[PDB]
Amino acid sequence: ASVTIVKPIVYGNVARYFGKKREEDGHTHQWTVYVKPYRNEDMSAYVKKIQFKLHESYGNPLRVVTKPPYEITETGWGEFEIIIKIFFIDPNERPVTLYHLLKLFQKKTVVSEFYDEMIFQDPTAMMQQLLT
Template structure:
């Protein structure tokens, strides 16, 4: 039986694997603070990369690196085995760069994705938001995505087809799965928030413009009187 090659590609074949990345953040109870917690840290959070519905992804992912904010000690955190996650505490929101390395048999370069750490609930009316903060509800922010292996090496093809479930790329990105509907709702929420912010900015700009036009008109009227 011929050996399986780490360099020869399987032509005309694409295999994708779905995965989920994101974070969960929980407000710290001031009456039950963990020992050695910095006084300005308000939340505990975990950022992670994992399979959909808990599926194993370690047979094709070698390691995952999380680039935290530079204010953290050792901001580059690397997980060589599952769970691919980092837990920390803090007070601010920031972008986390996630870099995924594949097993050597893949012959693939690492891929990066970006996640904005979310600590606070933003969607809902004031009463709902106040209640969520008062109850210290966890804030979840996860995204569904797909890793696509176009013409994988023979060795990677064997790994992907002999472990887990191999699927062809979907026409519409985001086939139904864990977190998919939630992610879609979160994206809609973000869009609605963005639309509202834009509307508020437009209204403020209009008010400023009207005020300036009024001031110009008053100055013009004063000059005409003279």
Template sequence: MPQVVTSQHIVKRQKQFGFHMRKWKICIYGVNARNEEEPLPYVDYIEYVLHETFKPPLRKVIEYPFELREMGWGEFDMKIRIHFKDKASPPVTLDHDLNFQHPQYEIPHVLSFKPDVKPSFMKLLSQAPEPSIERETPLSSNDEASEGKANKRQRDTIAKDRSKRLKEDQSSDDDSQQDSSAATSGDEWSEKINIRALAEKFQELSADDLLELVQLIKANQTEDMYVKEDGEAGEFHIDLQTVGDKLLGVLWQFCEKRLSQ
């Protein structure tokens, strides 16, 4: 089954609207029942549908592990479309929550296919380091030992490749832990904001600016804040009384910048 792995870290000395920029990466690995990595030979390519502020928002990746790298300051919900080598099988769309709560998180997904798929595609689906298909003739003890060693070598090779990729990511993120503390302490906004005046500024923003404002709020939402989103009605509610001084200051600066353009 495919497993979506997301990793992210803070970029030093880069901020936007008072918030640290982050580099993030998404990969899609194959994982078997023993939680071991295996290839995805039945996948043709992956499409990532990003937030519309990314240009272009649609990204196509054709090589395993279908890695996508980007940079930004906000969290958002995205779509991941898996296209299969059997064109008779329709693409599968996964909902993915890109968030910055953890340096890395993994989400497995189970795929299901119709029973009438082509034999050639069924063969791709059954390909794995240790196939579960029974043989017609029994194996001798020597054959079993040879097959076991071959499968172990294949699993070890995949594991080493993934370990190498993770180490390469970690080597480029040496100071990410140190920077994470800076993201929460930051430059505090000391002045008190006129909440009524801030709410009036919200009314003057354009539709695109309001969308970016919502992303800004969601990226910095805490349990103490009252936020309610109604996707069907296209409404977003927030009680500014529950927002901390720092975020209020950032929202004020955002409005000032957009309304002065």
């Protein structure tokens, strides 16, 4: 590519352990799954929406966030892969797909966070402007 623009991100989840297993639904944790820029920037300048695909056991498993912060807070008992799909304002830009294993146990606070880079190769002039 003649122009390469790299936007570093971090993604993953935090989990907060209840005293013990909740009687009503057996949930043990509140958790937040998220994507955020690696350093201070407003991704919403160039991100259209971020989808979070949860386990089939959630009644509403496809969650969508269009305004920062790009995060979903839920309760649960299970650890499973969440698919994070980042769509851009430029329809010419392929979405970014991330995969994250939700982590609840290592203990009152658990953080599972990873680094990645969204790489834009020869974007349109309009997307290059939004990115820079």
